[PDB]
Amino acid sequence: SSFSGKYQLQSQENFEAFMKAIGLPEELIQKGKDIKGVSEIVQNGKHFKFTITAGSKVIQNEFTVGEECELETMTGEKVKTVVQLEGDNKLVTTFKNIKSVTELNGDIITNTMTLGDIVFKRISKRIGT
C-alpha cells in the first residue's frame, strides 16, 4: 500500500523537449506544459493501478511488478514492458528507450524520465484522499 494516494504536480523540468522527442502533437504540448496534473495510485502488494489526469487527458494504467504489462504512454501508444520495485519506494521501467524512475519519499513523488541526454523530472505532492 506504500504508493497509494492522490498526488498533484508541483514542478517539472524539460517537459517541452521530452514531449517533442516522443512525438506528442505540439497542440497537446502547449495545452499540457503548465497543467498541474493529478496522479492517483492504488497499490495492493505487487498490483498497481494508476490514473494520470492532465486536463482532458485521462490515462489509466495497471501492472503487476515483475510481470510483462501493457502501458499506455503520453501519445496513446501502448507498450509491453516490465515494472520493477527496487525497494518499497521505487518503481523502475524502460519503454521506447526511456528509463522511468518513480520514487516516493514520504508525501513527495519524484518521477524522472530519461531519453538519451533528455532528463524529464516531475515533482508531485500528496493532496488528501
List 17, 52, 85, 115, residue binding ligand PLM (CB under 6 A):
52
Contact at 8 Å (CB) between 86 and 70?
no
Residue 43 interacts with ligand PLM (CB under 6 A)?
no
Pick one of 18, 22, 43, 91: the residue that binds ligand PLM (CB under 6 A): 91
What is the nearest approach in angstroms of ligand PLM to the Cβ of residue 7? 6
CB–CB of 21/32 below 8 Å? no
* # residues contacting ligand PLM (CB under 6 A): 27
Q: Is 83 in the site for ligand PLM (CB under 6 A)?
A: yes
Member of 21, 28, 82, 118 binding ligand PLM (CB under 6 A): 28
CB of 74 to ligand PLM, least distance (A): 5
Contact pick of 1, 56, 105, 129 for ligand PLM (by CB under 6 A)? 56
Residues 119 and 124: their CA atoms lie apart, in Å, by: 16
User: What residues line the site for ligand PLM (CB under 6 A)?
Assistant: 7, 28, 31-32, 35, 37, 39, 50, 52, 54-57, 59, 71, 73-74, 83, 91, 93, 100, 102, 109, 111, 113, 122, 124
